[PDB]
């Protein structure tokens, strides 16, 4: 009795927009409304074989022949102008609420059990831990993925925008708030209270996030990369495409959303590596490894089936992880 639903789907909370890039000078950050956009250009790249050879030391003349016919490509590139040193990345993020309610469900008993389970979750403790971790990931500019690496100074401005004007302003130094640990601060806990009030359904939260990274004059910034499938063989010259909303280099919204939910510090491997993004079988692509394997009893699906069907409430950290995966949304069903 009380089996899981065959179809079950959750719309995402914490919707971000596409993060648009512009360039300007530091200490002109308060006049940064007429800053020009960072444009995407093309350049020619000639390179040679720096990869491993399939037949290692058995063909040196093939190596010399491949160096006499080098690879010619055309690559999309995005730099700051030579007279500006600060990248400004701007997006908006709205926090909605109604986190437990599925957008599709087959069994009515399953969704009533799920709704009362998340109701007991909110009743025991609020969204305060999850919203504190989300406000941390907004405080440090983790959404600057490679634009933050080696930055001289990162500064985040967060505007809570109630009506058509700004209701509150936060100002953080993103290099002080580390990428490693979750601290406490009055402004950060006030922002966490706002995010938790949005997550509970007691208010409508719309924020404008603007990050300023001090990289250097003319240095290269890193927008999102598009798909270039089945165009690298016939001519093969265009080999890298950068994402852009109209004539402006941009980061994908799902990349910002992946940087926001990097909150999972409860995975059974260790915690000395740092937080990861919440996911069923919480996995990193750059490491090629799934933490929270289903052979261990700590992935999302077994935890949700134990909490909902058999009423085995896990630890409060694993409950935080399950509710974070419900906030993330997704297609959960018999596939």
């Amino acid at each position: 009795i009380l089996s899981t639903a065959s179809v079950l789907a959750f719309e995402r909370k914490l919707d971000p927009s596409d993060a648009l890039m512009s360039a300007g000078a530091w200490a002109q950050r308060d006049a940064s409304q007429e800053w020009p956009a960072v444009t995407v250009r093309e350049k020619s790249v000639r390179g040679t074989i720096s990869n491993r050879l399939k037949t290692k030391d058995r063909d040196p003349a093939k190596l010399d022949a491949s160096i006499q016919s080098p690879n010619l490509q055309t690559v999309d590139v995005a730099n700051l102008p030579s007279d500006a040193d600060t990248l400004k990345v701007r997006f908006t993020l709205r926090v909605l609420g109604g986190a437990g309610t599925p957008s599709a469900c087959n069994d009515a008993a399953y969704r009533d059990k799920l709704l009362q389970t998340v109701a007991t979750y909110v009743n025991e403790q609020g969204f305060a831990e999850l919203a504190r971790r989300y406000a941390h990931n907004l405080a440090n500019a983790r959404f600057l993925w490679r634009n933050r690496v080696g930055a001289e100074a990162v500064e985040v401005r967060i505007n809570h925008i109630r009506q058509g004007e700004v209701a509150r302003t936060w100002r953080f130094d993103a290099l002080a708030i580390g990428l490693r640990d979750f601290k406490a601060d009055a402004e950060l806990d006030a922002l966490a209270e706002l995010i938790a009030s949005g997550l509970s359904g007691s208010g409508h939260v719309l924020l404008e996030v603007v990050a300023f990274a001090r990289i250097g004059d003319g240095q290269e910034v890193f927008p999102s990369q598009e798909l270039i499938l089945d165009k690298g063989d016939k001519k093969g010259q265009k080999s890298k495409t950068l994402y852009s909303v109209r004539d402006a280099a941009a980061i994908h919204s799902q990349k910002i959303g992946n940087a926001l939910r990097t909150i999972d510090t409860w995975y059974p491997d260790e915690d000395g590596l740092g937080p990861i993004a919440v996911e069923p079988y919480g996995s990193v692509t750059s490491q090629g490894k799934a933490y929270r394997q289903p052979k261990q009893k700590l992935d999302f699906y077994t935890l949700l089936d134990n909490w909902v069907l058999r009423d085995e409430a896990p630890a409060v950290e694993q409950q935080h992880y399950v509710i974070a995966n419900l906030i993330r949304g997704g297609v959960f069903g018999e596939a």
Binding site: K54, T55, D59, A61, K62, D64, A65, Q68, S69, D233
Partner: protein
């Protein structure tokens, strides 16, 4: 009810839909982990119809892999430079090549077919020796689709192929088109002892092929020369 055509697998989507009133299912064609295609095919399609729905994409993959991993071509020409007297598809370069324009000091030259030519002067006996040593088998391009640590001659670095890598060369859907019975007869084995190699997981009575048997099988299928 998945369908296996060599290294390709066509799986249905585990719940259908109703398109145009008729029940349908989404069939996905994978080449290992890489998802190649999706189609929406109706029910009351036999597995043969699902097979030659995707046969064209499989054939385009075969054409692209055959053109991409084609072996090199050396050309025996005379002293003037044009008028190719002979051609030979080699799997390796003769290692004494160094960029050459042929002159009339020697009557025979062996150039690369690639355009900044490398070349060597030969005398039709060392050309025959180089062509005997370095020639390519007729199905050498399948070596482009293999991990290379299963193709090495050094036994310290060699690892046995998996079942998916073994299905590139053995099987009715493989790129050699050689069944398991014929590949067992090539190795001097029985069909059941050879089918023990093609199970997939180590639990279901599957042992790995040996170094000598794998390299001898690649020799006898005309894939790697394996001298």
């Amino acid at each position: 009810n998945a369908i296996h055509i060599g290294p390709f697998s066509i799986t249905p989507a585990a719940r259908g839909l109703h398109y145009g009133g008729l029940p349908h299912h989404q069939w996905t064609l994978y080449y290992g982990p890489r998802e190649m295609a999706i189609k929406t095919l109706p029910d009351s399609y036999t597995s043969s119809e699902v097979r030659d729905e995707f046969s064209d994409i499989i054939a385009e993959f075969v054409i692209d892999a055959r053109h991409r991993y084609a072996p090199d071509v050396l050309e025996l020409v005379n002293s003037d430079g044009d008028a190719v007297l002979a051609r030979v598809a080699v799997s390796r370069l003769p290692e004494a090549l160094s960029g050459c324009i042929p002159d009339d000091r020697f009557p025979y030259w062996l150039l690369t077919a690639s355009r900044p030519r490398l070349g060597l002067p030969v005398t039709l006996n060392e050309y025959t020796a180089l062509a005997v040593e370095l020639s390519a088998p007729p199905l050498a391009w399948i070596t482009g689709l293999l991990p290379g640590e299963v193709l090495t001659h050094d036994a310290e670095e060699w690892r046995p192929p998996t079942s998916w890598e073994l299905r590139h060369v053995v099987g009715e859907g493989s790129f050699t088109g050689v069944s398991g019975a014929a590949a067992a007869a090539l190795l001097g084995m029985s069909a059941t002892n050879f089918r023990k190699y093609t199970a997939g997981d180590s639990a279901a009575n599957r042992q790995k092929i040996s170094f000598a048997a794998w390299h001898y099988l690649l020799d006898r299928l005309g894939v790697k020369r394996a001298s």
